[PDB]
Amino acid sequence: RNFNNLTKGLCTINSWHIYGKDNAVRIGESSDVLVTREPYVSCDPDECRFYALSQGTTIRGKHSNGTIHDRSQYRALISWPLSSPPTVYNSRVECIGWSSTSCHDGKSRMSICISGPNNNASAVVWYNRRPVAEINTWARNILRTQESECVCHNGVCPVVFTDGSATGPADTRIYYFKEGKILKWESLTGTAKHIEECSCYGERTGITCTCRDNWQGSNRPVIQIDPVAMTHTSQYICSPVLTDNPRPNDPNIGKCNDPYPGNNNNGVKGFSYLDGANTWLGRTISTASRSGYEMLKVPNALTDDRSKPIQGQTIVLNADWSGYSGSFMDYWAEGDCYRACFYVELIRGRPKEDKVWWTSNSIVSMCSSTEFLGQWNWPDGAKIEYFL
Amino acid sequence: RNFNNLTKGLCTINSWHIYGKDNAVRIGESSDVLVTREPYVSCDPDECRFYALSQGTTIRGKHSNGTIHDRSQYRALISWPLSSPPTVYNSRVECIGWSSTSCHDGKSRMSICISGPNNNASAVVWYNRRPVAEINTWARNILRTQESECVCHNGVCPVVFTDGSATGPADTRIYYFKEGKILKWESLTGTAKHIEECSCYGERTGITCTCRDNWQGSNRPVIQIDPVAMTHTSQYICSPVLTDNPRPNDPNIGKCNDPYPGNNNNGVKGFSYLDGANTWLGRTISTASRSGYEMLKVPNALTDDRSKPIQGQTIVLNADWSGYSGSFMDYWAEGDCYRACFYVELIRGRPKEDKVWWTSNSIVSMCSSTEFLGQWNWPDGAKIEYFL
Amino acid sequence: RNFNNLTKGLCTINSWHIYGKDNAVRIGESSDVLVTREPYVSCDPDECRFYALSQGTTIRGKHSNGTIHDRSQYRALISWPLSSPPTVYNSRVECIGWSSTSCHDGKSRMSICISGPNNNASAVVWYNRRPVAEINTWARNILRTQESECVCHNGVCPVVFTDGSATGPADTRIYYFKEGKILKWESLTGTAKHIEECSCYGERTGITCTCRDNWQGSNRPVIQIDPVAMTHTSQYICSPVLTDNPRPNDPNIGKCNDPYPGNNNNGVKGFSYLDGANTWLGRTISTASRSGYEMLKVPNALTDDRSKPIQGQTIVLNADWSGYSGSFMDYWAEGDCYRACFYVELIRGRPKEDKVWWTSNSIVSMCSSTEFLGQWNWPDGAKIEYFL
Amino acid sequence: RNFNNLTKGLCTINSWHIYGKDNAVRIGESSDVLVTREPYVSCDPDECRFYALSQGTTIRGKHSNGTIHDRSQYRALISWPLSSPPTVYNSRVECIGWSSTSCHDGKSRMSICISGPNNNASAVVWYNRRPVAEINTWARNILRTQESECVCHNGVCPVVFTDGSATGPADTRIYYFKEGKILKWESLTGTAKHIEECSCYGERTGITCTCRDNWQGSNRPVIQIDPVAMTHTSQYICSPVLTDNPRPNDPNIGKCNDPYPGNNNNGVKGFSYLDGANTWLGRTISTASRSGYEMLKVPNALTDDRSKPIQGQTIVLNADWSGYSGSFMDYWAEGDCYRACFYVELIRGRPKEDKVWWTSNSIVSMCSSTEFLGQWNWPDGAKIEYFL
Ligand SMILES: *[C@@H]1O[C@H](CO)[C@@H](O[C@@H]2O[C@H](CO)[C@@H](O[C@@H]3O[C@H](CO[C@H]4O[C@H](CO[C@H]5O[C@H](CO)[C@@H](O)[C@H](O)[C@@H]5O)[C@@H](O)[C@H](O[C@H]5O[C@H](CO)[C@@H](O)[C@H](O)[C@@H]5O)[C@@H]4O)[C@@H](O)[C@H](O[C@H]4O[C@H](CO)[C@@H](O)[C@H](O)[C@@H]4O[C@H]4O[C@H](CO)[C@@H](O)[C@H](O)[C@@H]4O[C@H]4O[C@H](CO)[C@@H](O)[C@H](O)[C@@H]4O)[C@@H]3O)[C@H](O)[C@H]2NC(C)=O)[C@H](O)[C@H]1NC(C)=O
């Protein structure tokens, strides 16, 4: 009934506990489960749900052949109950397209989907399940957005978009929406040199987004947004604990205002929680491919170019495939602090497992604990040979 | 809680954006998706849904054999969540029959289904999910109706029916319903010479229906209805931009008060938005068969027999199958204008793809934008060979 | 919020219109549809639903083998949305057992299921989805009940039970429930000599039940119940238009107070609407087996032993299988009269179609019209050979 | 809106009536039914539901191979509508883990799931569908809990946990939760020597839990909890009617304060209702394996070491497989007493039926009657050979 305001700080993060897991590939071996990728999680005031980009076919369906493809007319943003798999019969379509974001402002949910050919893409902004505003491509090269949830404050929901080359200078914009309408947009400023797929969270200080430099960087760009003034700045995570993938080995001095070099023209969506001594970074374990996942406690990672881990937790073993990761929080939970959460996309199939002709994923998700909890590891769990 | 009144004009239409798409044939290759045809879209005050005539079998089911047939005892009007496919487990049956219309009046939804043999058909009018009134055939020859949504004003919901020959003079009536009860009916008046499958929308000026002349015309008949006086007139779209299918090539002078000749005893359900300089017409790209779909901006198409396009947008490539098309709007959306919307039925199977024994469809739907958005094309997307 | 009172008379019945049809066997050929039998329909104040006794297996499931059996531990009363099929995923279990009745009193629904071996069966009475009262067998021989909906007045819902031989004298009781609790029960009185499977409806005059004499009669016993005094009487339909199955040919004088002879130890559940000149009887067309179905207007059938039809309507052709039939009405519909409704069970499989090893059914349902509507015929529609 | 208080005594138990049964294995032979084990039942103020630990695969799915395993990353506590089977499309995930409990306090539901490796397991406590508190392992040996519902009084919901050896002395704790937060915990006191899988119910006197001694006992330990003082005591059921499995034959003197010897390092979850002369015990019929199930009326079983049965009821024949059993009640039912209920897990597959590679179950559930009802028997009902 009222817009949510970001009035709390992050809860102290001493470990991570299991929040959700859908086992979608395991179940989809023998159930009508939609092929997906680019999943995330987002909360309403009364419910938290899984989100992803469907490929408009089930995994066992013959149309799963070719689903490594990123952008087709058969994709849509869908949502479904927490820890259920995305099935044909329980998935709610939020909008049509092949790149998305979504968030609830306390009153209603805004969802954004982009569709179109590479040179003529357009975003449609939905609010309370109705289309409200539209944004045409500005650089005519795959207009695209976060692939995880946005964050709102007093009705204002900033969203990061990029249009242009994925392997060079591009045109990144921050849009400020309210009830789906465009209040304002800004071109990217600050020292981040390339921006993709921002993972955002909000707290009393403002909104923090950790992104993917797909051009020259293996450190992650950060965009900090003031949703009241509707302004932002950008830089990189200063820490030498590098968190993109693929990536070089960790040095002892990171880079605050420029890409850390070694790997070009690639990356993976990821996230971090940047909160002084309460700072935690997520990354794939492997420096070469999207396998494994760990959280590392790196004090002042955002600002300290010497910072190293003082604690950690394995989420997925290096022997198991991971993928995209991003942040979300239940802004409507009771208590005096916001509990940090994240999900990890567990990609199965192509390109790495090419005995099948499809690409899909399942989801695992965690939230922070003030306890120091024992760790497990959370594989997708499907046997690829069952699909042969 | 109150009846909706048509108090707004159309939003300015500068392009079209994707609204919904269910990918039903793709998904139905390996899911329990009902065989359908004659789909449409209609909104409640709190939700918009897909509608269609089920054939009472799934596509993979052996009973899909023979579903080219138009009128069986196994058909029903079903509705299901926007952009989901019509599955056995998520489809709500509105009423039983093989021709239908449906609309919400602001308080409750009226649904009409016609069933029966060709010489003894009858309509049942449902209101708030209960049968309220019934109408017996008057010409004993396939009593039939719109196959898209009706429109209401202050509780009054006009509906166009036809009974009689589909290839000659027939008996068309306009009925005026309120809470499912018959207030009044009228025989067709005006210059339209044959009427089928009217696609309607409402705005402050009244209700506008674009129909199908299945007898001698390839221009589309139009019926204009005053839901307050409960009266109507009819003519044809004057424009030489002809919009039926099949159809002759576009001349330079159209016909306002008589069928444009060249093609007899056939047609396709279609629609238009007739709003002065803000006028847009939909049509198949092919003049020979139901393939492709485009929208054309044709100023004053209704009244100007010389009018030509000044802008357009491709919806479906000519290389891809289309089918029926019709209008709907979310009359309960916020703002100062009604946003024009439409759907296109994408028919797959027989008669054109006869290596399968079934006929079904999927749906694509668009709404207008005040932006000038880039265009894509929206194929059904199923590979027919997967069903062999 | 208040108990419903029976304050209206029946609407004038001039013909019948299609109300619902689920096509369950057609769809179940390739969908997870539960095997059922003994279906019915019953309304809540906000919704009308299909009901039936599941067999605890789908039709395609290997456990469908043997489902001709009447009483197993795997049966349950289920309900599901009007005109949907009874699927594993959309069916709500009301209670466990192999004989049932159910009705809404205006505030909440009472459901009764009987389970047990032949000599030790017991009824459990559920109210507002909780078990409230239980009734043990009194004759130790298949305690059993209506297999269609009961009817309530000011909270009082009478139900007819039988315990004892199905082919001789048995012990029939009328129970009077309120909020699931037993107010009173009575032994059968009047001239009906054997009672099974009563089909009931209520109006201002009281509650009328048409039953099945499975012993010596081919005319139908009738029980008339005053839900205020909680008393009843019984007789037979006097009309020589005989309505059981199997049955002798129609004579010219029927029997008011004794079974009409010719066929012993068999019958079928059926119904009638007994309302003076507005009287309609349902029956199978065949006198030999459960095939075909027709409604006949037989003025004063209840009291006139000479009464013959003056109008009729075919529901199912004799060439198509029928089965059980029963009455229900939407007591919560608006207007000044109760609209008579009925369903027909369309049995497929064993014993008549024994190339399959299962027995199931679909449902067709009609309601009365004050119009004189054209008639169609409504087959189950499944091709049995598809299941081989 | 208010916390439930335990203000009533147990209803007099004179027999048991069928409450629910899902036939999950029968249906899962040809439907997307999840593999489960460790099921239970629990009520909300407006609904009662089935619960179980999913294995993250369907029965027909190839991933059902190996589901005898107790603790994997693919398990989750799910709930689903009463007497429906646990399907992919109707099951709601409550939390992730391989051991669980859940209960409603009158306002909202608390659910607890434990996950992790054997030496590093942790419990997450959810309240109103959000994670609220976490508890780390204290003995580093399979932290584990009830596998049936907990019970609340004025917001306080006690839960019994065990950590440590399953075949020797272990560390059992009673936790006291309110709105998911830990008010207090206590180490086990009293004469019970080993505690597993407590089955609890509440009434005005307090909360009673019947557990499983997996070490040296074949009599069942009992924990009695005062949810106001938040204190407890423990002992064994004194009766010589022994109720664990496997177990020795019944002696004539039981043991109140020590394990009854004969069988070591095994057991089965079970329950009892301990209420003076109104006392009923459940047990498997076989003393050797988990087959059959019966209820026995054993007056003062808790305190009388000579007590023997004076009445009984067979639930499952010895010829049929049973498994875990536990207590629940609808604390929100109307009336002056709490109606005792229980469920029995009917395990199918491995280890006893090893021609299949999976292990799953279905559920049967009963509630008490004040009538003396006839008894039936309730097998799972699936034919194992259909799965070959
Ligand atoms: C039950 O569950 C519990 C809870 O989960 C389990 O306990 C957990 O165990 C895990 C696994 O060991 C721990 O995670 C690691 O944490 C360490 C950080 O803690 C260590 O270091 C701290 C900092 O020390 C520095 O400062 C202090 C200041 O005093 C100074 O004294 C010290 O000398 C040093 O200068 C210490 O404070 C800390 O000690 C404390 O905690 C101890 C317990 O851990 C305890 O015993 C002590 O008493 C004290 O209380 C401790 O020593 C992380 O460093 C580590 O992450 C690195 O290693 C993993 C591989 O295991 C790797 O994947 C990570 O990426 C990372 O290493 C890479 O990056 C580094 C940084 O750039 C680089 O330096 C490395 O060379 C390495 O780089 C290579 O790999 C990466 C990745 O592939 C690649 O990108 C690079 O290019 C390169 O190739 C782990 O996260 C948990 O913290 C711990 N949790 C708790 C609460 O205890 C418990 O084990 C379970 N029980 C059982 C029986 O299983």
Ligand SMILES: *[C@@H]1O[C@H](CO)[C@@H](O[C@@H]2O[C@H](CO)[C@@H](O[C@@H]3O[C@H](CO[C@H]4O[C@H](CO[C@H]5O[C@H](CO)[C@@H](O)[C@H](O)[C@@H]5O)[C@@H](O)[C@H](O[C@H]5O[C@H](CO)[C@@H](O)[C@H](O)[C@@H]5O)[C@@H]4O)[C@@H](O)[C@H](O[C@H]4O[C@H](CO)[C@@H](O)[C@H](O)[C@@H]4O[C@H]4O[C@H](CO)[C@@H](O)[C@H](O)[C@@H]4O[C@H]4O[C@H](CO)[C@@H](O)[C@H](O)[C@@H]4O)[C@@H]3O)[C@H](O)[C@H]2NC(C)=O)[C@H](O)[C@H]1NC(C)=O
């Ligand atoms: C990214 O996306 C954007 C947005 O979608 C893309 O931009 C769009 O591009 C499409 C495709 O070109 C455009 O659609 C066409 O629009 C034209 C109408 O616009 C043209 O004509 C206007 C009218 O000109 C007249 O009046 C002016 C008054 O000043 C006068 O000056 C002029 O000389 C003439 O007298 C012009 O105003 C307009 O110019 C403006 O816009 C230009 C951009 O388009 C711009 O460059 C200019 O500067 C200016 O601003 C422009 O010239 C439609 O005519 C056309 O539809 C016809 O053609 C298609 C085939 O492509 C056909 O399917 C249609 O049915 C139709 O042609 C049939 O019907 C005609 C009418 O009867 C008939 O005459 C034809 O012979 C033909 O008939 C045959 O086929 C039919 C169908 O099968 C059959 O039934 C007949 O029997 C017969 O066989 C298109 O709709 C969009 O308007 C445009 N949108 C925007 C906002 O720009 C962009 O391309 C994308 N980018 C990339 C890189 O892909």
Ligand SMILES: *[C@@H]1O[C@H](CO)[C@@H](O[C@@H]2O[C@H](CO)[C@@H](O[C@@H]3O[C@H](CO[C@H]4O[C@H](CO[C@H]5O[C@H](CO)[C@@H](O)[C@H](O)[C@@H]5O)[C@@H](O)[C@H](O[C@H]5O[C@H](CO)[C@@H](O)[C@H](O)[C@@H]5O)[C@@H]4O)[C@@H](O)[C@H](O[C@H]4O[C@H](CO)[C@@H](O)[C@H](O)[C@@H]4O[C@H]4O[C@H](CO)[C@@H](O)[C@H](O)[C@@H]4O[C@H]4O[C@H](CO)[C@@H](O)[C@H](O)[C@@H]4O)[C@@H]3O)[C@H](O)[C@H]2NC(C)=O)[C@H](O)[C@H]1NC(C)=O
């Ligand atoms: C479009 O749809 C419309 C609407 O549905 C269709 O119109 C409908 O058509 C059907 C089919 O014909 C009609 O159903 C039949 O109705 C008759 C009753 O109506 C007839 O009889 C009335 C009574 O006459 C008596 O009294 C009058 C008083 O004046 C007196 O004048 C007369 O001489 C006689 O004494 C007449 O009033 C009535 O006339 C009126 O209506 C006419 C239209 O029908 C109209 O033309 C007239 O102008 C006038 O207005 C009319 O003559 C039922 O008798 C009949 O049911 C019997 O026959 C069917 C087989 O068709 C059978 O299945 C039934 O069970 C029943 O016959 C069995 O039972 C009898 C009673 O015991 C027995 O006597 C029979 O021998 C027979 O018994 C055998 O079979 C049974 C069953 O298997 C077995 O159990 C026995 O043992 C034995 O073996 C039909 O129900 C509709 O009424 C009619 N509706 C309307 C509104 O018009 C229209 O056709 C469709 N259009 C097209 C093109 O298809």
Ligand SMILES: *[C@@H]1O[C@H](CO)[C@@H](O[C@@H]2O[C@H](CO)[C@@H](O[C@@H]3O[C@H](CO[C@H]4O[C@H](CO[C@H]5O[C@H](CO)[C@@H](O)[C@H](O)[C@@H]5O)[C@@H](O)[C@H](O[C@H]5O[C@H](CO)[C@@H](O)[C@H](O)[C@@H]5O)[C@@H]4O)[C@@H](O)[C@H](O[C@H]4O[C@H](CO)[C@@H](O)[C@H](O)[C@@H]4O[C@H]4O[C@H](CO)[C@@H](O)[C@H](O)[C@@H]4O[C@H]4O[C@H](CO)[C@@H](O)[C@H](O)[C@@H]4O)[C@@H]3O)[C@H](O)[C@H]2NC(C)=O)[C@H](O)[C@H]1NC(C)=O
């Ligand atoms: C329709 O449905 C109805 C309702 O369900 C059916 O009626 C039911 O029928 C069942 C089956 O018979 C009954 O269950 C049994 O109940 C008896 C208890 O009742 C008997 O004993 C009572 C106590 O007598 C003692 O005190 C009295 C005090 O006066 C004294 O007089 C007497 O001499 C003695 O000292 C009697 O009061 C009672 O009589 C009353 O009820 C009679 C009807 O039952 C009636 O005829 C009388 O007039 C009177 O009114 C009656 O005699 C339980 O003992 C029994 O449970 C034992 O047996 C079963 C096997 O059947 C077994 O599975 C149980 O575990 C148990 O036996 C084991 O444990 C014992 C205790 O340790 C042990 O002693 C045994 O040796 C045995 O141990 C072995 O097996 C176990 C298990 O595998 C193993 O662990 C051990 O190690 C060892 O190997 C049954 O539960 C119902 O009570 C009854 N219900 C009602 C309301 O009547 C009706 O039959 C159905 N109709 C039809 C046609 O089918």
Ligand SMILES: CCC(CC)[C@H](NC(C)=O)[C@@H]1[C@H](O)[C@@H](C(=O)O)C[C@H]1NC(=N)N
């Ligand atoms: C070309 C730009 C890419 C991001 C830097 C690309 N984004 C889009 C909209 O295509 C992603 C990338 O190619 C894939 C990934 O690296 O796994 C997913 C893919 N993302 C989506 N398909 N939504």
Ligand SMILES: CCC(CC)[C@H](NC(C)=O)[C@@H]1[C@H](O)[C@@H](C(=O)O)C[C@H]1NC(=N)N
């Ligand atoms: C004979 C009259 C026809 C319309 C002019 C016909 N309508 C009905 C009720 O049968 C349509 C037409 O035959 C088919 C179409 O052209 O695709 C669909 C078909 N419409 C439906 N099956 N609902």
Ligand SMILES: CCC(CC)[C@H](NC(C)=O)[C@@H]1[C@H](O)[C@@H](C(=O)O)C[C@H]1NC(=N)N
């Ligand atoms: C033996 C008594 C019979 C009724 C007269 C019998 N009723 C029960 C409870 O078994 C019915 C009868 O045998 C079958 C019918 O005639 O189709 C159904 C069957 N009814 C049900 N299975 N519910």
Ligand SMILES: [Ca+2]
């Ligand atoms: Ca990079």
Ligand SMILES: [Ca+2]
């Ligand atoms: Ca035409």
Ligand SMILES: [Ca+2]
């Ligand atoms: Ca009979």
Ligand SMILES: [Ca+2]
């Ligand atoms: Ca034991």
